[PDB]
């Protein structure tokens, strides 16, 4: 009788609690008619704790939407950390900037507007400690190649949505399952990466993520 | 037949891990000694390895060794200068694990400490620990987490295995590991020294999940 969404509601109440900044971000995202595809609270808290564990101070995110995952990354990187997040849609970037300011992390985050393949070669500063790749899935492999080039040795790369209900193994007419399957094959074969993939369930259904360490950059 | 999580894990194993004769030998030795086949899956073990590597862990504490499968992955992630202390109360499990760690080339990084963890944890001087993996008798998760906080550095990572148990944490069944998991999660959420999340997983081992926490303060 218990199902993964019910368990996630319990985990949210038990481990995350009331989050008025993310509640406001959801309402603002809804008012702007953004798709409800942001990370769940357990998933966002995972990104936050991952950034905190490695003491990430330079974080790259590809795919901002309304800034939900971005807020979590900025929380984990802390007041000394900086997050650069890339977003193709001007309307998404504008909502995210408002959501970031209301969550109190605007001093830590820059939203860079444009196709990520055009903005990544000009991104400056220093090498990244953590890269979260969550944009157009057909460019996952290009984004991972960029992540390796722009990350420090030992940086963490996280790729969202790599399982898609098992569609990566099924003759499924799902462009992003095709992309996710090729992404996993590329990560396994790449000599500069050491990677794992964890299948997940919860409020967003059966999916999963890839996590890799940059061996050489 | 549509793909299921075990099928997907087999693909992930073949694609991201590949042939691993050290872990193949560890499984075979564990089977030969009739250990329960309840080790972490390869994707789960690799996650522990990459987590230790990501935080550059040099002192790792594991509670619940079995045949050393999770231990091998932790030792791989800690590197040649890293050290793992792993606690096991069954002498036969400890003996199998020591053989498996040697064949995995990590015996010089790992100490298996034999005895009930509640009795050996106060004798440990191998800290402060950077990473604690809690995977032993579930009714003592909460005690082991309290010890982990005491023995860890600030900012250390604590991972607790098997905290979902097929959704049983929401049921009122006389189910020891689900009752313990629910209490474990409630304790972690309430502890002012911990910041925690829990991820539900599927795969070879079915619907389960893990808790991950940062030690915010000793
Ligand atoms: N080529 C591209 N470059 C940058 N962003 C892109 C892109 N293609 C799609 N996107 C953006 O990627 C986002 C994916 S949804 C991202 C969700 C977010 N990470 C969260 O969990 O809260 C969308 O906002 C979409 O506009
Ligand atoms: N009180 C206790 N102290 C130390 N070890 C204990 C214990 N109670 C149970 N155990 C041990 O905990 C182990 C749980 S199975 C551990 C599996 C292992 N972590 C892997 O993934 O490969 C068993 O070997 C069991 O004997
Ligand atoms: Na690889
Ligand atoms: Sr996503
Ligand atoms: Sr079609
Ligand atoms: Sr276990
Ligand atoms: Sr009983
Ligand atoms: Sr049970």
Residue numbers in the entry:
A (entry chain B): 6 to 222
B (entry chain A): 5 to 222
From the paper:
Mycobacterium tuberculosis (MTB) H37Rv is predicted to encode three COMTs, i.e., Rv1220, Rv1703, and Rv0187, which share 29 to 36% amino acid sequence identity. Here, we present two crystal structures of Rv0187 from MTB H37Rv with and without cofactors at 1.64 and 2.08 Å resolution, respectively. The protein adopts the Rossmann fold typical for numerous SAM-dependent methyltransferases, containing seven core β-sheets surrounded by eight α-helices (α1α2α3β1α4β2α5β3α6β4α7β5α8β6β7). In both ligand-free and cofactor-bound structures, Rv0187 appears to form a canonical dimer observed for all known COMT structures, consistent with the results of our SEC experiments.
Meanwhile, the ASU of the cofactor-bound structure is composed of eight monomers, and each subunit exhibits the unambiguous presence of a divalent metal ion and SAH. At the initial stage of model building from X-ray diffraction data, excessive electron density around the modeled magnesium ion was observed in the Fo-Fc difference Fourier map, signifying the presence of a more electron-rich element despite magnesium salt being added to the protein sample. Since strontium chloride was included in the crystallization cocktail solution, the extra electron density most likely arose from Sr2+. Therefore, Sr2+ was included in the model for the subsequent refinement stages in place of Mg2+. Pseudobipyramidal geometry of strontium coordination is observed, similar to the octahedral coordination of magnesium or calcium in other COMT structures. In the cofactor-bound structure of Rv0187, a strontium ion is complexed by Asp-139, Asp-165, Asn-166, two water molecules, and Asp-178 of an adjacent subunit, which is non-crystallographically related. Located close to the metal binding site is SAH, a product from COMT-dependent methyltransfer reactions, where the sulfur atom is approximately 5.3 Å distant from the Sr2+. The overall binding pose of SAH is essentially identical, with slight variations in each subunit. The hydrogen-bonding interaction between the N1 of the adenine moiety and the backbone amide group of Ala-121 is universally conserved in all eight chains. The amine group of the methionyl moiety forms hydrogen bonds with the backbone carbonyl oxygen of Gly-68 and with the side chains of Asp-139 and Ser-74.
